[PDB]
């Protein structure tokens, strides 16, 4: 049903976007149920959802039998082209600690 | 936004100030047979019908609203059908 259960106070979009404190084992199924036709975020930073296809990301993941967040990073942000970057954070996105 | 990258292929992004560069990334394989339901999932059923929810297989076929259904299911039919168990009507004499 739910992308990861046990990621409480998290929606599937939340889990999909990688919102802090929503992370967990997304187990595998040969059958999935699509409960949210227009899925939603339950917090973090304000998104303008409707200006991209982003809303369907969970329903897309759902289509597959096996899903998994990755490990590491597909790119180093700080060394990216355009000059060295500090990495931004915002309240409304608290982590295991808080902050 | 998200962008899907086929099996093996790389991808590209162009940007100016304010970019969120991707870090962790989804990795998916296999395929699950998706239906349109509404939690919670209660108990077991033989069949899952998009209109009727849980279903248990009783007779081989069913009449009614047809939609996508997964599992051991009865088959949809236009009209309720009867197999004859008996004789032709005979007026007494």
């Amino acid at each position, epitope marked *: 049903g739910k992308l990861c259960p046990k990621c409480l106070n998290c929606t599937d979009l939340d889990v999909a976007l990688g919102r802090p404190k929503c992370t967990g084992k997304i187990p595998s199924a040969r059958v999935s149920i699509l*409960h949210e036709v227009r*899925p*939603v975020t*339950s917090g973090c930073f304000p998104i303008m959802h409707d200006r991209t296809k982003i809303r369907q990301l969970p329903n897309l993941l759902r289509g597959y039998e096996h899903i998994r967040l990755s490990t590491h990073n597909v790119i180093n942000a700080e060394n990216a082209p355009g000059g060295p970057y500090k990495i931004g954070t915002s309240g409304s996105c608290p982590n295991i600690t808080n902050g | 936004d998200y962008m899907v990258q086929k099996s093996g292929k790389t991808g590209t992004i162009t940007y100016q100030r304010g970019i969120l560069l991707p870090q962790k990334v989804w990795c998916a394989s296999g395929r699950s047979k998706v239906i349109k339901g*509404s*939690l*919670p999932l209660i108990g077991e059923a033989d069949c899952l019908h998009e209109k009727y*929810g849980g279903l248990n297989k009783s007779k081989p076929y069913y009449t009614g609203e047809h939609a996508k259904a997964i599992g051991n299911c009865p088959i949809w039919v236009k009209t309720p059908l009867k197999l004859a168990n008996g004789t032709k009507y005979r007026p007494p004499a």
Partner: antibody
Framework: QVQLVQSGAEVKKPGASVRVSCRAS????????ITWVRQAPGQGLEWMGW????????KYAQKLQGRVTMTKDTSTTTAYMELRSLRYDDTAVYYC??????????????????WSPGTLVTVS | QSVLTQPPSASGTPGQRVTISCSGS????????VYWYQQFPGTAPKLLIY???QRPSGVPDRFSGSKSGSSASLAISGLQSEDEADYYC???????????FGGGTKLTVR
């Protein structure tokens, strides 16, 4: 123990609005919903609408679309019902009830369970 | 004017079996599950029968649910003084896109 606790009794002039509160306890709020039902004094039950504790999705009774709004707050596990443009017909007891359904189209395939004590709203 | 039709009154001497009918149509009782609620004066209604035939825990087998076509029925057997209340049937109605309630029957057993 499954609990629902509502805001206090309200009294309002015709034309104003009421926000009734419904705080939830003893179950996983984010995997259930709230319906609201109201009861005119000495009368029957009128379904008002439902809202998901998982997604905030709502479905309202046809007669009350426009006038009603439901919202919910996962943090405080609380649901709210707002009724605008009060007339004398809106005098009733407002119940909230735990509804088993929390996602998919709301189509009455599920049901609602426990009812809160009731909040009276008197419309001068 | 209620969508589901319930007699206003039902009665029986203590010990007897009384029935309460509930009369609807194809869009509601015909295609949907029936639910029954019991209300004592100045209290919340309580779920008495669910999915047409089931009993919640606490509800004695004295209470029984029935359904046939577009009509459902509540049977109360072994009638007792504490069953004096109001009984409401409810089902979803696909035509009105919302739940519907019967007018409520008052059960009088002295």
């Amino acid at each position: 123990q499954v609990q629902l606790v509502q805001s206090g009794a309200e009294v309002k002039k015709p034309g104003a609005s009421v926000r009734v509160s419904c705080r939830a306890s003893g179950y996983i709020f984010t995997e259930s919903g709230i319906t609201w039902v109201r009861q005119a004094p000495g009368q029957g039950l009128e379904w008002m609408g439902w809202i998901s504790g998982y997604s905030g999705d709502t479905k309202y009774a046809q007669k009350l679309q426009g006038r009603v709004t439901m919202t919910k707050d996962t943090s405080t596990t609380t649901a709210y019902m707002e009724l605008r443009s009060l007339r004398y017909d809106d005098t009733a007891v407002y119940y909230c009830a735990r509804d088993v359904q929390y996602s998919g189209s709301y189509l009455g395939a599920y049901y609602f369970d426990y009812w809160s004590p009731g909040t009276l709203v008197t419309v001068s | 004017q209620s969508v589901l039709t319930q007699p206003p009154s039902a009665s029986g001497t203590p010990g007897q079996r009384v029935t309460i009918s509930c009369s609807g149509s194809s869009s509601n009782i015909g295609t949907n599950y029936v639910y029954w609620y019991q209300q004592f004066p100045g209290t919340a209604p309580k779920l008495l029968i669910y999915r047409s035939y089931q009993r919640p825990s606490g509800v004695p087998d004295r209470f029984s649910g029935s359904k046939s076509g577009s009509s459902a029925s509540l049977a109360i057997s072994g009638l007792q003084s504490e069953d004096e209340a109001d009984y409401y049937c409810a089902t979803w109605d696909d035509s009105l896109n919302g739940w519907v309630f019967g007018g409520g029957t008052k059960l009088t057993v002295r």
